[PDB]
Scaffold this active site. Structure first.
Site, PDB file in Angstrom:
ATOM      1  N   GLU A 194      37.920  28.192  22.889  1.00 53.77           N
ATOM      2  CA  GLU A 194      38.100  28.861  21.559  1.00 53.77           C
ATOM      3  C   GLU A 194      37.085  27.861  20.961  1.00 53.77           C
ATOM      4  OE1 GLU A 194      40.962  29.418  18.220  1.00 53.77           O
ATOM      5  OE2 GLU A 194      41.743  27.605  19.842  1.00 53.77           O
ATOM      6  N   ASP A 227      34.812  19.009  14.383  1.00 57.60           N
ATOM      7  CA  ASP A 227      34.711  17.019  15.114  1.00 57.60           C
ATOM      8  C   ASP A 227      35.348  16.736  14.248  1.00 57.60           C
ATOM      9  OD1 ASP A 227      33.240  14.863  15.467  1.00 57.60           O
ATOM     10  OD2 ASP A 227      32.166  16.537  16.331  1.00 57.60           O
ATOM     11  N   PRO A 266      38.189  10.251  18.126  1.00 61.88           N
ATOM     12  CA  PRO A 266      38.417  11.312  16.764  1.00 61.88           C
ATOM     13  C   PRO A 266      37.307  12.516  17.428  1.00 61.88           C
ATOM     14  CG  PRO A 266      37.860   9.372  16.108  1.00 61.88           C
ATOM     15  CD  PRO A 266      38.487   8.996  17.552  1.00 61.88           C
ATOM     16  N   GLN A 267      35.983  12.578  18.172  1.00 61.48           N
ATOM     17  CA  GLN A 267      35.293  12.853  19.424  1.00 61.48           C
ATOM     18  C   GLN A 267      36.133  14.783  20.041  1.00 61.48           C
ATOM     19  OE1 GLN A 267      32.445  11.433  21.490  1.00 61.48           O
ATOM     20  NE2 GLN A 267      31.385  11.582  19.872  1.00 61.48           N
ATOM     21  N   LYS A 321      32.403  24.714  29.123  1.00 58.70           N
ATOM     22  CA  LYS A 321      32.787  23.416  29.793  1.00 58.70           C
ATOM     23  C   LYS A 321      32.186  23.928  30.902  1.00 58.70           C
ATOM     24  CE  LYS A 321      34.860  19.765  28.540  1.00 58.70           C
ATOM     25  NZ  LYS A 321      36.416  18.902  27.718  1.00 58.70           N
ATOM     26  N   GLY A 367      28.658  18.909  23.003  1.00 58.01           N
ATOM     27  CA  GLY A 367      29.070  17.328  22.790  1.00 58.01           C
ATOM     28  C   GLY A 367      29.346  17.339  24.443  1.00 58.01           C
ATOM     29  N   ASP A 388      43.644  10.272  27.157  1.00 61.79           N
ATOM     30  CA  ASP A 388      42.065   9.513  26.164  1.00 61.79           C
ATOM     31  C   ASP A 388      42.119  10.565  24.834  1.00 61.79           C
ATOM     32  OD1 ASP A 388      39.466   8.471  25.653  1.00 61.79           O
ATOM     33  OD2 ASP A 388      38.613   9.829  26.511  1.00 61.79           O
ATOM     34  N   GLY A 390      32.319  17.210  32.059  1.00 66.27           N
ATOM     35  CA  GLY A 390      30.419  17.933  32.538  1.00 66.27           C
ATOM     36  C   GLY A 390      30.369  17.330  30.624  1.00 66.27           C
ATOM     37  N   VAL A 443      29.111  20.479  27.249  1.00 65.65           N
ATOM     38  CA  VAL A 443      30.553  21.349  26.504  1.00 65.65           C
ATOM     39  C   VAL A 443      29.108  21.785  25.650  1.00 65.65           C
ATOM     40  CG1 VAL A 443      31.912  21.524  25.671  1.00 65.65           C
ATOM     41  CG2 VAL A 443      31.820  20.054  26.673  1.00 65.65           C
TER      42      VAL A 443
HETATM   43  C1  LIG Z   1      32.405  22.060  17.362  1.00 68.56           C
HETATM   44  C2  LIG Z   1      33.289  21.449  18.503  1.00 68.56           C
HETATM   45  O1  LIG Z   1      32.911  20.517  19.487  1.00 68.56           O
HETATM   46  N1  LIG Z   1      33.614  22.671  19.125  1.00 68.56           N
HETATM   47  C3  LIG Z   1      34.865  22.852  20.262  1.00 68.56           C
HETATM   48  N2  LIG Z   1      35.177  23.803  20.775  1.00 68.56           N
HETATM   49  C4  LIG Z   1      36.533  23.826  21.402  1.00 68.56           C
HETATM   50  C5  LIG Z   1      35.824  22.833  22.633  1.00 68.56           C
HETATM   51  C6  LIG Z   1      35.107  21.828  22.563  1.00 68.56           C
HETATM   52  C7  LIG Z   1      35.280  20.771  22.856  1.00 68.56           C
HETATM   53  C8  LIG Z   1      36.299  20.673  24.568  1.00 68.56           C
HETATM   54  C9  LIG Z   1      36.810  22.228  25.114  1.00 68.56           C
HETATM   55  N3  LIG Z   1      35.865  19.943  25.539  1.00 68.56           N
HETATM   56  C10 LIG Z   1      34.976  19.011  24.294  1.00 68.56           C
HETATM   57  C11 LIG Z   1      34.152  16.978  24.757  1.00 68.56           C
HETATM   58  C12 LIG Z   1      33.677  16.584  23.347  1.00 68.56           C
HETATM   59  C13 LIG Z   1      33.805  17.826  21.779  1.00 68.56           C
HETATM   60  C14 LIG Z   1      33.867  19.246  22.072  1.00 68.56           C
HETATM   61  N4  LIG Z   1      34.951  19.202  23.767  1.00 68.56           N
HETATM   62  N5  LIG Z   1      34.932  21.277  21.166  1.00 68.56           N
END
Ligand SMILES: CC(=O)Nc1nccc(-c2c(C)nc3ccccn23)n1
Length: 264
Positions: free
Chosen positions: A63, A68, A112-113, A29, A11, A109, A12, A14
């Site tokens: 991790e 989400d 829910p996401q 990321k 979903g 910020d 800079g 990720v």
């Molecule tokens: C399904 C999922 O998003 N898992 C997950 N695990 C760890 C971290 C993240 C993550 C991090 C570190 N930044 C964002 C921004 C948007 C969505 C998920 N993330 N996302």
């Protein structure tokens, strides 16, 4: 980065990835900063997504969690998240924020996401220390030195959305966001918010709407839950309830830790 195999776009940007040699699946990321990122590696808590490694060669290795809260709300939209499961998630996020806030770190910020969940019934904060719907009104009115209260505001909008299965204030521009807040809680003035009329983007020409009853804004929520929500949405940031004091609110007298029904 030769040590990681991109599984897929999360979903800079990720990425879900596998440490090519270690076993770990992780969330990767791709992005004074370096020193700021080094202070986050030491900010460890059960309700904070763990920052495993910082690779300046700048990538951040977190991790991984499987879902989400935004996708979970869409999947529960027909029946809604059981109230005991809503109450458990709010209690835990309030724990996360209390922790962050006692080390002087803000999220800034929340939405829910970026709230992540597992099969064990746990919920975690992500994007810590790094859509307008969850934005605090002091940020909208131009305050440049805003406080930890901006997070409490955002968490309350999220609380409300879980209970009603609708977005509280779904604006598509800064002024639209602001006027939706005003139409529900009434246009603020010096009585409810001292200093409001002398904020950088405040205009004496703002329309003057009257406040609505909270029993209309989140109907199915019981009285303790509506009392706590109105203290999380107070206009004046210094009146807004802190994370620590919300944890002692009578709403959480009967709190449990239910397990969610997750389809992965
Ligand atoms: C399904 C999922 O998003 N898992 C997950 N695990 C760890 C971290 C993240 C993550 C991090 C570190 N930044 C964002 C921004 C948007 C969505 C998920 N993330 N996302």
């Amino acid at each position: 980065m030769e040590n990681f195999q991109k599984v897929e776009k999360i979903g800079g940007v990720v990425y879900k990835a596998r440490n090519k040699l270690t076993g770990e699946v992780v969330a990767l990321k791709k992005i004074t900063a370096i020193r700021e990122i080094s202070l986050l590696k030491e900010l460890n808590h059960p309700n904070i997504v763990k920052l495993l490694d910082v690779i300046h060669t700048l990538y951040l290795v977190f991790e991984f969690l499987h879902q989400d809260l935004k996708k979970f709300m869409d999947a529960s939209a027909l029946t809604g998240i059981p109230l005991p499961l809503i109450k458990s998630y709010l209690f835990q996020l309030l724990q996360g924020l209390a922790f962050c806030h006692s080390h002087r770190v803000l999220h800034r910020d929340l939405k829910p996401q970026n709230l992540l969940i597992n099969t064990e019934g746990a919920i975690k904060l992500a994007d810590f220390g790094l859509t307008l719907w969850y934005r605090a009104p002091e940020i909208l009115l131009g305050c440049k030195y805003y406080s930890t209260a901006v997070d409490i505001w955002s968490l309350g909008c999220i609380f409300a959305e879980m209970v009603t299965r609708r977005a509280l204030f779904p604006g598509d521009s800064e002024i639209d966001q602001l006027f939706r807040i005003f139409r529900t809680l009434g246009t603020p003035d010096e009585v409810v918010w001292p200093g409001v009329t002398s904020m950088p983007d405040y205009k004496p020409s703002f329309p003057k709407w009257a406040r609505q009853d909270f029993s209309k804004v989140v109907p199915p929520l019981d009285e303790d839950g509506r009392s706590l929500l109105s203290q999380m949405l107070h206009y004046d940031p210094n009146k807004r309830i802190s994370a620590k004091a919300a944890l002692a609110h009578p709403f959480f007298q009967d709190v449990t830790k239910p397990v969610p029904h997750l389809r992965l």
